[PDB]
């Protein structure tokens, strides 16, 4: 059972739910929506071996980036014709990683589910690999999974990336996300790299 | 909570979901299965800066049309070839935007999910980047956003495309989509191109 | 309404809910964590003509494999080299298909959506194209739909691939998945490719 607006409010207000920054003209009729980030990860490896602690490198933009579909293939030229002519600080290629700017804490019996918004996909950009279902408990920012799937796209820093939408479990659940020893991700605070190796 | 195949019936009936044309064959277990319109758009820019009105193209197919992952790098010999072996009236590569035949009013207490069938999901066929949820208050058709990402798919005019899954709000929403003044889609009648340069 | 841990249990216990086979410390806060199959199955067409029977290949792993993103163009030298270099047992490009260990069967009202685990999604792997729902009714494994977006990924046999999240229906189905005659993978026992050719 999915909150509406005025459930978001009350849940934010009683702090049932918490969102650091809240903003009401980014509650909608049953989402809240979540905006992006100035930092991004993008990975180094030539494969991911799961059992290994991945090497990575951080960006911090200052107004724009532009993610390019895999096997755009990307030389130094390329990026540099891009920089010039958009004015963006960051060509990146495939899979880039990001974060939304809102903190999120969620008690017990609320779920959240985080999709991207329906603009964005209608240019062919995602920024979730999966259904995006946070766990009841759960604490931190929201690690955004990038990939553009037609041509470039020109992302701003703190644009409206994508939305919350919250519902009620059946029964409260005895251990929130945050409560579990091997939870890998609460109290999120920027972008952060895949933990699968700490499985 | 969502609605089975009686409650979708329901509220068909009532007028509280409006779902034009309706057929009861396509209620399943719950949700209601879509079907593919005949016009899709596909972009013309080189990349896509939503700050822009963007470049299009549209096409209505008589049949059928074979949609290509991105980087099979279509020639127009292969387009051609591809014509002749399959006989299919487009060929395109990458991302193409379509639309549902089924044009849909949604009140201020229900919320859908548009997913693809599973059927499609097997051969690599997605018709949505994002997680598909439509705000209560919605109206109008679905824009599908269609990608294939093993090898290339034929899709037919008119075939069952995905479904939609419908959700209760524990609270009504204030505001339905349709009501709200920035409401980019609603009334959809064909499919749409992006219009998130109105953000 | 989305089950909780002790829902999940409770569901279980009664056997109104069937997960065979079920481990209590893959129930979460809100979700019950599913593990890969040790069978793949990927497609030998040039095209997906849905209305013919698809051509495919088997494969059965002993511990690992390597899945690479579309048009990372495989050469069999390239095979090799990743076999020797990170023991695994198949290289293999694009899309593949795979199953979960897990056989359910839900009750008529129950749903089940599908979805990856976060830290996969967080290296660019997707095990389901589509939103993930699983009608009321259902009963089977579940069909993996995998694909890399970066950069190759290794997955072992038995990992947790991902999570069913349950949800109660407002109202039970009159027909469950199983009870319908059109039902195409009702008691899936593997892998099991596309059938949409029945449609
Ligand atoms: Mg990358
Ligand atoms: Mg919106
Ligand atoms: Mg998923
Ligand atoms: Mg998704
Ligand atoms: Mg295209
Ligand atoms: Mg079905
Ligand atoms: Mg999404
Ligand atoms: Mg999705
Ligand atoms: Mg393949
Ligand atoms: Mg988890
Ligand atoms: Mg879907
Ligand atoms: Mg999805």
């Known amino acids: 059972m999915i909150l509406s607006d005025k459930d978001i409010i009350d849940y934010v207000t009683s702090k049932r739910i918490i969102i650091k920054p809240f903003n009401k003209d980014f509650v909608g009729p049953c989402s809240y929506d979540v905006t992006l980030g100035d930092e991004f990860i993008i ?65 017990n019996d609320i779920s959240a589910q985080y999709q991207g918004r329906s603009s964005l996909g209608r240019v062919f950009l995602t920024s979730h690999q999966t259904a995006g279902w946070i766990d009841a408990g759960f604490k931190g920012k929201i690690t955004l999974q990038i990939v553009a799937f037609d041509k470039p796209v020109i992302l701003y820093k703190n644009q409206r990336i994508g939305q919350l939408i919250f519902s009620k479990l059946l029964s409260p659940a005895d251990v929130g996300y945050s409560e579990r020893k091997t939870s890998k991700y609460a109290y999120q605070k920027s972008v952060m790299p895949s933990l699968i190796h700490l499985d």
């Open 43 to 107: 990975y180094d490896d030539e494969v991911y071996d799961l059992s290994k602690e991945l090497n990575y490198k951080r960006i911090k933009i200052k107004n724009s980036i532009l993610v390019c579909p895999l096997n755009y293939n990307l030389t130094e030229e390329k990026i540099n014709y891009f920089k010039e002519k958009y004015n963006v600080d960051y060509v990146v290629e495939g899979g880039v990683l990001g974060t939304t700017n809102e903190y999120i804490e969620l008690p």
